[PDB]
Subunit: 418 residues, 4 copies
């Protein structure tokens, strides 16, 4: 165990009394509202979100990167750190890998994962940067590059990601590329998209039937004029064109200012193309900040659509959940811990919505009560439920407090080169 | 003739020598660039854009409306004013009607149009406002309203618009509604969209074999939280679901901040669902300003996509263009005149792009020369072409100057009581 | 009383048990956090926000207006409705008037206000629309219009607003105009601003010693290319130029997409130019939606800056608080009630922030714990505190539910003629 | 001469005939508008904009950097490339240095500059990144950092920049920092600003009597929640607080979506705090794209304000203009060349505005004719003037064409490492 069990027990005992008081109080409040707190905690204990291997190390901007102490070197150190997040929150049993950054012996990866109590989520291909010894540069694109050999190289790389994923237990390939243009006229919009579609079709041919192929849209960056997979509309066309196993991945920070993202989620669900989510928060662009740190209500509204879907009985609805963030000014482990917590927080609150009451207010066009019905759920402080779920499943009542009391950061700082 | 022919002749002849000088100078320049000015002028003469009947009246905001003199009241006054725009620019032969604002005896409407030299473009339904004696209010929606009777009333109204259009020569119905919500939870996104699709399917059934049904997306306003037909993504789902006769209308000012609109145009063209483009300009929201008055280059880039499709062929490409603006601080006739001019200006410049050279630079990923190739066309002052095209077709060399010299505004001001 | 006391009493009794349980539970939780819930409730029950007279009637857009039943006939009906909001929430004792919309004999306005237990907040001038009989139109501007006589007309109107306010107990004038341009070149940015500053100085000259002049910036609408008072930068230049009695009014929905509004608030406070707030919520533009219905955290963050001002010891800081919203698809009274509630909600949460802990995390650059410190306050459900504050002050535990139980809307619907 | 004079001559003679024709044609056109093309050309030959030393190297994003061949290594290589831009465009005689990147013997820099025919513009400090051996990290800020020792280090660095500038002929220091926060609560907005103002006051004390101190605002990036110097309002407070020698720098891509940037320019000029303008273009955020490649009209409108200032007779107005761009997918030298050209293009068009006619239309509130007055200037293709201006001053008629014909890139690619 990355974190000593005695430290976990000690820090849980220190806060056990208060938690009992808060949990029983919330339990009584919920019972008065016709909700069984135990039913909610039971569901919360089953909600999982994948952590990004590339998010365990300190992130940076084009201006600078300010690493902290004990930075993980390689995927093995990263898995060790991810193990801490799972142990304390119990909400991140799976890790999402990025190739070639995390390329290593599949048997070893799988072996280390099993030892750490971690599984592997969707693989992530990388054709938005050049690796050492690469034959063709992705400077002007990859899967949609004008040069056939470059597209071929990109397709092969993606197929390799599938091979690695199959060996470790992954069940999906997420494809996000920077392909686009920085100048009007640089790219022929339609021809570029045609090349992309043809390349993805080749990747789709190599996709196992138990896998999903996720395409991720993004309005801009690295391309600053146009992007091939720029929004959910183009993304839908891609998924629909490719096949039943192809779906769209929605990253919260990849939309134009003021976009109603939760509606995008609902539309994709209605047409069976909501592959999964990339959680994070933002205020200006693709800021990649800790989930819920900027607009917690928006996060709740997205989950409201997810919970409504299940309520409406949508079949085969098992969207993938992943955190896609960059931690530039905090301890990556702490941020991922609290981000995973915020995701479960939004989910739990969405579970509290009185669906029957809401349905009634929507049908009668009682906008005020309809919105207040959502607010009654959102305003509820579900921390006691989150903390109890962790406590009952081997985690920490207060993950960050236990993390800091363990001295893990100082430990790995002493074991890893500065 | 709304404007005395002798006035047009007079104003044109005084400027004839100057125009000839500019036309010949530009011709020599285009000749050196391997372009035949005559070929461009010929195409410009045949580019038309519909004028909205409601556009000749002074517009306003929710804060106030400041009418000018001689305001047209009713469709008859409006057609009289629209006739001026066509006579002077020769780029707006067809008018788009709005029901019930323009309700009148179909035979009278058609007779008046024929007399003024005006045809009728797409009909526009109105279920975003309540008419006197209306059985059900559209306060909470229309085609997507939760009340079955309300949706039925909206459907019948649209069918009635088709019946009126059939009687006057129209071949399409444009559907733009305000349907949406101002509060989270007020509407169930998916159910509202399902209701909308079901209602539109009924309207689709009353569509003659040679008619088209256009759905128009808008991010927000009048709904300030969510809008059923909020973007081109939803618009595409609508058109594809309804059938071959259903297409999407792209209104420039209806997109989120920083949206790459020309790409949306390309995407719709590729999948055969670009029903038409609604021209106007904007800086903040759906400002409905004179086309090209704010971002003339963006207008050119949209036309670059239209000309590429117009030239390279492309199946199902028969866009029905219309100007959709609000004139709050100018003479509506003058603004529509210059907006129509600006639209032809961007078209003309798009026709100057060296397609072969551009394609070459795109294939070689020569971004700088690709963008410069577009700029060489855009930087060209094609006013001489626009003016000569008008002169050859019965219009005015300088439309606004001629309009002012005619004293038309003062004339209608004396005929119409403020 | 607009709302029968027996109804308020009955609806309060019906919910007494649940409130006791929730309030006492919250109180114990706060105590464990070193917070005295009684101290918080005591401050909450004293937080007031002015209600707009123009907000009690149903609003609309340029596309349409869909009135409900019992729409107020004039200012007197509007005051009657504002009295309902105050009686039930006890958070809106003052009303903001708009001239000429609310023109009437000052003596009578004051008399009705006194009778209903309502006071009057800042006056609001109107030179963004033309009233009957004006010598000059405001189509191309007002205080910054190129025509000298038009600017003078606008100044005199504002001076008249001050006279009305003086007679009814108001102590400030808020100036928001639509002045700007829809086309590049239409206006000379600098000349228009110079004209505006000059005119505003004459309005300032007419201010009593104890009055304030608030200028309100807005990025766009009605002007769609440029606006004379477009942002807080220009607004600061205005207030600083006019004098000590001139301050800036920040309306939440009047900023560019993604603007960090709470920072603007902090900057204005630092330089003593934060006159007050116009509360509302939005997602796209100046949506004028119910406060907190879209981004409740942003509202909390704005209040975090207001409370921090006190924590830093800023002297003579008494910003004016007003709700400026448009209720297009709800009963205006209910939206104003819940908006006032949402404002007290954010204020209450800001009061819960452990300022001592936050200062520490800020100094040592512990960003995660610093943000979590704000969240611990924001995540707290303070509804019990709000409800108790109302109970103690003669209000309703659940304002909207009580309003609906009273049948007030159906009553005024039968009393007021629908416009024809 | 970085570029062989024989090449410049040959490439000019090859295009001299066409240029003569277009120039005379434009001259006749302008004469009819009461404008002497020679007077315009004379002023254009005198318009200069500084080039960023760091702009000649290929830029990148946080995702990747795709360097081209012959990447400059060190300030001396960079000056060699800047010389090419100045030689061919004759519009960029001054270079802006960045410390510590361009640190070198002031005597040698000056000597190399004089030899290349280049001068030096404003110095640029760097406290948005950490350098080796640095005592205190700027991870959590610099001039506004909570740690006094860190702020002192930042101050000393800026003073060092002034000393270096005093030795090479610079007359200003530009200060742009990343200081800000990524999370609500992380920073106290007021305290952070107070710390910044106090640190800047110390830097101001190191300014010679004839120097300027420029502060540059930016809405976001690297800070994603709040930025100390976030907009022009805060920037004004800074300049007004520091003193007469402190002014504001307006970088085009550093504003919120839809911001009216030209108004900000006008406001700063009115209050004497417009230190200078940083040119570039953008569509989404701080894209740092080639000037005028996305919104050429906006660039023209900014120049309309700069030219109006002269027309109004504003005293002591000597703005320090510089190009601040990132060239990620083109040859840096070619982009800077066309960007400088675009800047002169906008300036020239601004000079064509009929100020008398414009003020007349502004006074009578003739919005349509006022905007058309600006458009008459903007629609004028001034390329012949720009080209002739270059030809007469030793530059190239077609800069990029000559640059490519010279083979400079391949040349330095062989002299420099990969
Ligand atoms: Mn992602
Ligand atoms: Mn991303
Ligand atoms: Mn439209
Ligand atoms: Mn519109
Ligand atoms: Mn307001
Ligand atoms: Mn407003
Ligand atoms: Mn800059
Ligand atoms: Mn920049």
């Amino acid at each position: 165990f990355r974190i000593a069990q005695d430290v976990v027990a000690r820090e849980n005992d220190r806060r056990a009394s208060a938690l009992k008081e808060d949990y029983e109080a919330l339990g009584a409040n919920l019972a008065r509202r016709g909700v069984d707190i135990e039913a909610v905690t039971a569901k919360v204990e089953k909600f999982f979100v994948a952590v990004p291997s590339w998010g365990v190390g300190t992130g940076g901007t084009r201006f600078a990167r300010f690493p902290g102490t004990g930075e993980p070197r390689g995927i093995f150190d990263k898995l060790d750190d991810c193990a801490v997040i799972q142990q304390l929150t119990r909400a991140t049993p799976n890790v999402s890998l990025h190739i070639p950054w995390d390329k290593a012996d599949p048997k070893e990866l799988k072996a280390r994962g099993d030892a750490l109590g971690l599984g592997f989520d969707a693989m992530n291909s990388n054709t938005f940067s050049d690796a050492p010894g690469q034959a063709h540069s992705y400077k002007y694109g990859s899967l949609s590059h004008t040069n056939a050999a470059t597209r071929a190289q990109a397709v092969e790389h993606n197929l390799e990601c599938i091979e690695i994923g199959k060996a470790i237990g992954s069940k999906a390939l997420t494809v996000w590329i920077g392909d686009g243009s920085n100048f009007p006229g640089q790219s022929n919009f339609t021809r570029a998209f045609e090349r992309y579609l043809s390349a993805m079709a080749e990747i789709y041919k190599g996709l196992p039937d138990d896998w999903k192929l996720f395409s991720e849209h993004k309005m801009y960056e690295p391309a600053f004029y146009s992007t091939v997979v720029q929004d959910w509309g183009t993304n839908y066309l891609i998924a629909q064109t490719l096949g039943p196993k192809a779906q769209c991945l929605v990253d919260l920070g990849h939309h134009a200012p003021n976009t109603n993202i939760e509606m995008i989620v609902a539309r994709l669900i209605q047409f069976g193309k909501l592959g999964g989510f990339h959680f994070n928060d933002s205020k200006y662009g693709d800021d990649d900040l800790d989930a819920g740190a900027i607009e917690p209500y928006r996060l709740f509204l997205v989950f409201n659509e997810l919970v409504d879907a299940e309520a409406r009985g949508v079949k085969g609805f098992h969207p993938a959940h992943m955190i896609d963030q960059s931690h530039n000014v905090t301890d990556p482990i702490e941020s991922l811990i609290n981000s995973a917590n915020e995701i479960r927080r939004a989910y739990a609150q969405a579970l509290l919505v009185d669906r029957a009451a809401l349905s009634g207010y929507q049908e009668d066009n009682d906008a005020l009560m309809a919105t207040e019905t959502l607010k009654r759920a959102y305003r509820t402080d579900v921390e006691p439920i989150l903390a109890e779920a962790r406590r009952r499943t081997g985690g920490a009542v207060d993950p960050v407090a236990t993390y800091r009391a363990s001295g893990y950061r100082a430990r790995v700082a002493a074991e890893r080169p500065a």
